[PDB]
Amino acid sequence: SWSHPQFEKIEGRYKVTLKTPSGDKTIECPADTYILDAAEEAGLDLPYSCRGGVCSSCAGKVAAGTVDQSDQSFLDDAQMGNGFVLTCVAYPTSDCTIQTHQEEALY
Ligand code: FES
Ligand SMILES: [Cl-]
Ligand code: NA
Numbered sequence: 001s002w003s004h005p006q007f008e009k010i011e012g013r014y015k016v017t018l019k020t021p022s023g024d025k026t027i028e029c030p031a032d033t034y035i036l037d038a039a040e041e042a043g044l045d046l047p048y049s050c051r052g053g054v055c056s057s058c059a060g061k062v063a064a065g066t067v068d069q070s071d072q073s074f075l076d077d078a079q080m081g082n083g084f085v086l087t088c089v090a091y092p093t094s095d096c097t098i099q100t101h102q103e104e105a106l107y
Contacts, residue, residue: 008030008031008032009030009033012030012031013028013029013031014028014029014030014031014065014092014094014096015027015028015029015095015096016029016035016039016092016096016097016098017064017096017097017098018039018046018060018097018098019063019097019098019099019100020046020099020100020101021100024097025044027039027042027044029092031091031092031093032091033091034087034088034089034091035060035067035085035087035090035091035092035098036048036051036058036087036090037088046100046101047100047101047103048087048088050088051088051089052088052089053069053071053072053086054073054074055074056074056086056103056106057088057103058086058087058088059075059103059105059106060084060085060086060087060090060098060099060100060102061083061084061085061098061099061102061105062083062084062096062097062098063083063096063097063098063099064095064096064097065092065093065094065095065096066094066096067090067091067092067093067096067098068090068092068093069085069086069089069090069091071089072085072086072089072090075106079106084102084105084106
């Protein structure tokens with residue numbers, strides 16, 4: 001192996017502000033890391049079920065910034081156009097603010 005952590009995990013991280021029901025919590029999220037994975041590693045308890053982009057459990061809404069959720073399946077094109085994000089399969093592509101716990105907002 002290597003005598004250092006992976007550069008991709010130490011450097012170049014995006015700021016992700018999770019606007020949760022219990023307040024805003026800003027974490028660093030590597031570009032190669034799904035938002036849910038960074039949040040759960042940081043000790044947050046965000047909702048999820050399938051971890052595969054096929055449900056609404058981990059849904060959030062992008063309040064600021066952009067994501068890459070090319071692996072997602074469940075959201076329709078309009079929902080994604082309107083800012084919904086499946087946090088379990090979404091990489092940040094900018095500093096961003098994601099309101100969590102938005103499953104119920106989906107129609
Ligand atoms: S937990 Fe099912 S889509 Fe994210
Ligand atoms: Cl949950
Ligand atoms: Na990587």
